[PDB]
């Protein structure tokens, strides 16, 4: 019959998910063990937290 009927809804689907992080490059301390200028001895290793 004549009139106005509500059938469904509408929704704009999104694209291009975006992830943003700050300049978190504070320390990254691996140059003291990986490529030390003078490598540590065999039995006196260096422990660096």
């Amino acid at each position, epitope marked *: 019959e004549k009139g106005i009927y509500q059938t469904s809804n509408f929704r704009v689907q999104p694209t291009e998910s975006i992830v943003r992080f700050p300049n978190i490059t504070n320390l990254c301390p691996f140059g003291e063990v990986f490529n030390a200028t003078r490598f540590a*001895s065999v039995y006196a290793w260096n422990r660096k937290r």
Partner: nanobody
Amino acid sequence: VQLVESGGGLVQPGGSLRLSCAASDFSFYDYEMSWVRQAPGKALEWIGSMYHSGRTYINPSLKSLVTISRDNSKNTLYLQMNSLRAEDTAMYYCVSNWASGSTGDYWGQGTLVTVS
């Protein structure tokens, strides 16, 4: 510098030479000590090393003229090299806590030596 060395000078080929560097506390020499020198135009040449008890191992390449005396109360150790040849016009160094690693050793300055 907290580590000084005494000895050297112009010596006729064949003389003797000595170096003196000392510490103060009994526990500062834990646990490894050695010696090293850098002649101009020469790479690193390790000679010998010893632990607290005094057991020594020496590089076999130049192990014929090695003699070392050690003290504990004076907190010292001496590397004595004799028969001064014409290839020792460089600077020497003694090191405390040699094996502790890259950041666990303290270096010195040495003295000039003239050889003909």
